[PDB]
């Protein structure tokens, strides 16, 4: 094997899909899900 599947997970659509309160609550956690998505994009580009 050479490469894996290029998964991309949207943190907001996953945790607080179609809602405002949970997104406003998660906004207090900083950049966790955003940096996880950035790491996933890095995984994808390194697979490429």
């Amino acid at each position: 094997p050479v490469s894996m599947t290029k998964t991309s997970v949207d943190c907001t659509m996953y945790i607080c899909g179609d809602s405002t309160e949970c997104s406003n609550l998660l906004l207090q956690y900083g950049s966790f899900c955003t940096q996880l998505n950035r790491a996933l994009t890095g995984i994808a580009v390194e697979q490429d």
Binding site: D10, T12, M13, D18
Partner: protein, 48 residues
């Protein structure tokens, strides 16, 4: 909140964006109306 270039500027937290491609949370289409579906129940109450 004006153009996607400024959106990428907010994303990278810098006034200068290099040659590349980025974005943020996905844009979702909202439902136009609400459709209620319920049976056509035939049994009536014999109040008559």
């Amino acid at each position: 909140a004006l153009d996607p270039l400024s959106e990428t500027k907010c994303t990278l937290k810098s006034f200068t964006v290099e040659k590349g491609i980025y974005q943020t949370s996905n844009f979702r289409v909202q439902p136009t109306e609400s459709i209620v579906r319920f049976p056509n129940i035939t049994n009536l109450c014999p109040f008559g």
